Amino acid sequence: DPGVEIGNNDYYTWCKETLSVIDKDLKISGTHSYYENQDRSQVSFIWGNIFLLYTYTEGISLSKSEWSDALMNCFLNFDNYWHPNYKGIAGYATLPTSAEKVPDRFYDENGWTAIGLCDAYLATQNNSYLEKAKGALAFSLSGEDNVLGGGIYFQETFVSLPVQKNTICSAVTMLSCMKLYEITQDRQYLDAAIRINDWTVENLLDKSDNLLWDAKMVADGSVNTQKWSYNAGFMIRSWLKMYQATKDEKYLSQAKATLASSEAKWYNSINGALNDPGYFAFSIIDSWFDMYDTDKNTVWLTKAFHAINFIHNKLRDGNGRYPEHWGTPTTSNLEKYDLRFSTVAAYMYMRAANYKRILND
């Protein structure tokens, strides 16, 4: 029973507490923008804001009236990161930008954002959210070409990084495509997800453990074989959507094989720890929630609540802050922190609150 794991845990309150501390530490006074880190000297990179977007969006499921304004204010902050036309195409930048400036854009960042904006549209029916979801996803899809036979580049403007195509770009683009396919019923999104998936499985999936390698270098086809939880997790979420859309059992079997291997590699089911950066490992928890949505087996929720309980009860420090990595209990207060460390925890708490509500309905 997940009931045993949920107990009297007030996930909804834990989320609000976490958001309060984030705002205190990192909200830029007089704005709805956030600093990157404890130095409070640079506006945040887009990524930590994406976890806020996800949190407020999920909040709508708990209370539309409580979270609608927060979601809209977040969306309007994202407008600061939107570039309406750089070298012929619109898309989000990693830092605030405007039409007359040169942006630094990433195909993965745009897909992470597209996912959130699709969910925001599903929650609210606000067309402006979907317009940007489509624009962000179009930007991600513009990173796809037949160099290496397919796949999507890490970034628009390579400088110090070698030119490469990356699993996370495949995976967030696939999931975005599947969400927009559900909304629009336009088969071109489904076909894109299938094409990108076929390339990704052929080039970046390790058949020995069903985990995902990180990237493939354009210069020589060499693979970065580092295995990160989020490369598996976003592929699992995508495959589960593809299963729902196609009813082809191959997607479910692949999702289950990759998820089992992800649990074996990263999850200590005894204490609930996830042995990776939180801003990656949360994707395994979202995979468990998707599995519950798929088969209604409550054991998936027991795992999710156990891991989220660990975050609160073992990772949270004496100042209500969160560490980068989820693998080990926190034993002293953090001196350094970036926006994404606590925002991902807030998101997890809101997801947990939602599933607690669903179980008690």
3-class SS string, the chain: CHHHHHCCCCHHHHHHHHHHHHHHHHECCCCCCEECECCCCCECCHHHHHHHHHHHHHHHHHCHHHHHHHHHHHHHHHHHHEEEEECCEEEECCCCCCCCCCCCCEHHHHHHHHHHHHHHHHHHCCHHHHHHHHHHHHHHHHCECCHHHCCEECECCCCCCCCEEEHHHHHHHHHHHHHHHHHHCCHHHHHHHHHHHHHHHHHHEECCCCEECCEEECCCCCEECCCCHHHHHHHHHHHHHHHHHHCCHHHHHHHHHHHHHHHHHHECCCCCCECCEHHHHHHHHHHHHHHHHHHCCCHHHHHHHHHHHHHHHHHCCCCCCCCCECCCCCCCCCCCCEHHHHHHHHHHHHHHHHHHHHHHC
Rounded Cα distance between 123 and 144, Å, is 29
Residue whose token pair is 């291997």? 261
- Resolution number, Å: 1.8
Rounded Cα distance between 349 and 340, Å, is 14
Crossing angle of the two packed helices 64-78 and 107-124, in degrees rounded to 10: 150
Q: What angle do CA 196, 202, 207 make, to 5 degrees?
A: 130
Burial class for 112, CB neighbours closer than 10 Å (0-12, 13-18, 19+): buried
Experimental approach: X-ray
> In sequence order, what are the beta bridge partners of 106?
155
Q: Which amino acid is at 223?
A: V
The closest of 170, 180, 255, 173 to 215, measured between CA atoms, is: 170
Rounded Cα distance between 165 and 216, Å, is 5
Which residues, including other chains, have CB under 8 Å from residue 46's CB and lie 6 or more apart?
78, 81, 92, 93, 94, 95, 109, 113
Rounded Cα distance between 178 and 190, Å, is 6
Burial letters for 300-320: b for 16+ Cβ neighbours within 10 Å, e otherwise? bbbbbbbbbbbbbebbbeeee
| Domains of the chain in sequence order | 1-361 (1.50.10.20)
CA distances from 33 to 36, 37, 43, 52, 255 (A): 10, 12, 7, 11, 36
Rounded Cα distance between 51 and 346, Å, is 8
Residue 212 φ/ψ, nearest 5 degrees = -105, 135
- Pull the structure tokens for residue 231: 């490369």
Q: Given the DSSP bridges, would you call strands 205-206 and 211-212 parallel, antiparallel or unpaired?
A: antiparallel
CA distances from 54 to 60, 124, 245 (A): 10, 13, 23
